[PDB]
From a paper:
The Lactobacillus S-layers are anchored to the cell wall through interaction with teichoic acids (TA), either lipoteichoic acid (LTA) or wall teichoic acid (WTA).
The full-length [name]_ac shows differences in structure and domain arrangement compared to the SlpA architecture. The middle domain of [name], [name]_ac_II, exhibits a SlpA_I-like domain fold and an additional repeat of the SlpA motif. The four residues observed in the vicinity of phosphates are conserved with the proposed binding motif of YxY….KxxN. These residues are not conserved in the third SlpA-motif, which is present in [name]_ac_II. However, [name]_ac_II contains an additional 3rd SlpA motif and an additional loop region, allowing for increased protein flexibility to incorporate into the assembled SlpA-[name] S-layer.
Residue numbers in the entry:
A (entry chain C): 188 to 362
B (entry chain A): 189 to 362
The structure:
């Protein structure tokens, strides 16, 4: 009998998901900082796991990873993660998802309001409006080195590859 | 001949080393035409002057003794005769031909927007320019387009045809 058991919820990029966490398969990039209740996928979408007392009670329930062997150092490896949620009467629900380690971290660009995202080119210390624009939800490679000019931070990006992002001269304001 | 007035001209500010006599110019339908100072179809200012003689650069009086030019209809030509007079009363005349042409400018259509964005191109980078045009504006367009990221751009200038070749003001073609 399941109805009194904890319910495991998840959000992807802020949006509650209707599919069960159990049996999900995620991509995570080599070198990413992975926590089984809060991690970032290969495309840069934040995934957050949480739980409630039951299907009919949204009150917070405790949830923890009872098995998290995940290691992000090497691509082409997968790991299963098992979560267990426990309610106040001590009833349990577990969910198991699979994490695939992939090569590259992309980031998802959020206009946070606007449909359109402005880009810039930097020449010496002059920042010029570029004609290229991105749409909210576009996925790009981002160079690891930001640049600050007139007290504003900029990140160098490319839809092609990480290496291209290091010299693309297409910049967005850092979030 | 040497004691007679000499007729000079400039095009876009540069003194010309060809006689004004026998020149053929293009002038755009609808333009204001003055035979001593006018703007050709490509936007270059042409200015006529005269001097007392081959060796005396002192100003000499020059006027159109025959100017039937009418710019209202393209495909018509007119001859213009200029006569210069020196202070001893010696005369020189020059005759040039004016062709009335249709506009050598193109019209920019915003296809919706009142404003038309322009760009600057450096290598393969396209940057937003601050210059804007209004729908219906007329500009000179360079004959060489440039394509970047599969988008075609045309290089333009409101001033002259020649300026459009190096303005670094571009619009999206068509
Ligand atoms: Br994923
Ligand atoms: Br001409
Ligand atoms: Cl833009
Ligand atoms: Hg721009």
């Amino acid at each position: 009998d399941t109805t009194q058991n904890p319910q495991i919820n998840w959000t992807k990029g802020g949006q509650a998901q209707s599919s069960s966490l159990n049996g999900q398969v995620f991509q995570v990039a080599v070198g990413s900082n992975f926590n089984p209740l809060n991690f970032t996928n290969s495309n840069g979408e934040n995934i957050i796991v949480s739980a409630q007392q039951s299907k009919n009670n949204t009150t917070f329930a405790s949830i923890e990873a009872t098995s998290n062997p995940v290691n992000t150092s090497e691509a082409g490896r997968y790991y299963n993660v098992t979560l267990t949620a426990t309610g106040n009467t001590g009833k349990k629900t577990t969910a198991t998802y699979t994490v695939l380690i992939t090569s590259s971290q992309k980031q998802t660009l959020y206009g946070n309001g606007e449909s359109t995202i402005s880009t810039y080119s930097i020449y010496g210390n002059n920042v010029l409006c570029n004609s290229t624009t991105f749409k909210d939800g576009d996925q790009v490679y981002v160079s690891d080195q930001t640049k600050t000019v007139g007290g504003v931070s900029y990140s160098q990006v490319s839809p092609k590859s990480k290496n291209d992002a290091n010299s693309s001269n297409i910049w967005v304001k850092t979030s």
